[PDB]
């Protein structure tokens, strides 16, 4: 009975019908976002693959993050290409829906993994008994990808025939849990920083972790809060008018896609060579 897979294309056509100007504005925003994400993530992938040598677990998590960002960026114009060249065909609307699920899951959890690795390398050096060991980072990335696939299969279904929403158990294990983890980690960092008795380079490392955690928190609260807020309100408040639901859903999807363009602030914290090649590219462009 009208699964979510049908509902995505139906919402696309419905916004194009009811609000043509807003639909075209969102198209322009998506195109600009795709351009910026493509150039930034291509530069990041080149830097993190063909330039850096020390393959720390943070580098592995960041490489998986730029792969996810590149996939979402590639899926961004695929939505409009499928909507125009192959309208009516809703089986071929799968790639951009999968891009939505990848942006919702993999980006969130890889940012969480980067924050966890940064925290564990500051306060508690365990001697790399369980952490570090880049095979462990590869296994964690593989498990995150498998979790994304399992989440997509559980939401959409085996053949995309799952009705209703069933959203309460997703936003807690998908948005509230990483937010809680990052919040408790930045709270621990703030509590450690407030207590006196820290030497200057330790304090510098702690405040750098503070900037990284707060940046990831801002990305979480800007690019992903409206989507889960709409998902909660569509179940707790079904009285809500339909036009408001459609507009809010499309704006939330636009911000969730904006996550791809807003992600590369983390790459400045991950490595030091990113701004170096950015300056090199700027110098090449100037001359």
């Amino acid at each position, epitope marked *: 009975e009208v699964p979510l897979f049908h509902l995505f294309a*139906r919402l696309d056509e419905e916004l194009h019908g009811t609000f043509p100007g807003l639909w075209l504005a969102l198209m322009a925003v998506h195109g600009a976002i795709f351009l910026a994400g493509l150039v930034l993530n291509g530069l990041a992938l080149y830097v993190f693959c063909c330039r850096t040598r020390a393959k720390t677990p943070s580098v592995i998590y960041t490489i998986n993050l730029v792969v996810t960002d590149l996939l979402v960026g590639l899926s961004l114009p695929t939505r409009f290409a499928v909507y125009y060249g192959a*309208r009516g065909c809703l089986r071929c609307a799968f790639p951009h829906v999968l891009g939505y699920f990848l942006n919702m899951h993999c980006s969130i959890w890889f940012l969480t993994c980067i924050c966890v690795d940064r925290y564990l390398a500051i306060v508690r050096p365990e001697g790399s008994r369980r952490c570090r060991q880049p095979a462990c980072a590869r296994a964690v990335c593989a498990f995150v990808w498998l979790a994304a696939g399992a989440v997509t299969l559980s939401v959409l279904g085996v053949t995309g025939s799952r009705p209703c929403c069933r959203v309460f158990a997703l936003t807690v294990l998908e948005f509230l849990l990483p937010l809680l983890v990052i919040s408790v980690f930045t709270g621990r960092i703030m509590c450690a920083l407030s207590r006196p008795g820290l030497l200057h380079q330790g304090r510098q490392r702690r405040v750098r972790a503070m900037q990284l955690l707060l940046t990831v928190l801002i990305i979480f609260l800007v690019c992903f809060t409206p989507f889960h807020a709409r998902q909660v309100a569509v179940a707790l408040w079904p009285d809500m008018p339909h036009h408001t639901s459609l507009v809010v859903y499309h704006v939330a999807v636009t911000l969730s896609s904006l996550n791809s363009c807003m992600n590369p602030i983390v790459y400045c914290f991950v490595t030091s060579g990113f701004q170096a090649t950015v300056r090199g590219l700027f110098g090449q462009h100037g001359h």
Partner: antibody
Amino acid sequence: SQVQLQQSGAELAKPGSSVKISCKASGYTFTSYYISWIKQTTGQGLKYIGFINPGSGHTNYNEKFKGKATLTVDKSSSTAFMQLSSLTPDDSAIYYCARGAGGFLRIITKFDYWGQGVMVTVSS
Amino acid sequence: DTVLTQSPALAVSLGQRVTISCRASKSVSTYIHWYQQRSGQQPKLLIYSASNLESGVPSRFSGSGSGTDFTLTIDPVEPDDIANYYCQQINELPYTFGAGTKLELKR
């Protein structure tokens, strides 16, 4: 063959009952083009009822006809159906199905072909 | 919801130029379809997007205008053009048709 949108014969109904009128498309890929249903009375002019995408199943209705007309699609035989519920002598009119081509700036930018029209007469 | 008001029905003569005026309520850029409802026949699309001829209609028809006022020009006329004419906007979703003009011969 050329594009055609065949329709059923004239229907005489009873007040308070329901009727179903079918528009069978032929000569083109059925799921690639919208099917729109439009009214015409003798006294007034033409009035647009709604449309439906056969592929994605997305439907849109006029505000006046919401809750009165219901649009469905059978893709196996490539036929659109419109159901009138709670018929009243107001609804005695001629109904047309139009093949609306998809557009870029708007959802539909062309209305190429029309059915021959089905006359629905509601009288006790 | 746009309201489209058409010109009153006017008498036409064989061979002379005629025009039909359709005035909208709000602004419709170029989204007026011009049909032709004959006696006991389905409407046949003559003009789409208020300026372009349909593939098949003779070149004697010509649509013009943008914004609020639109015109459809027929020159010359023959007894195949004595029929209804409807202007339909497709800008906003409640598609509104005009009242329709009755062309007829004069004697």
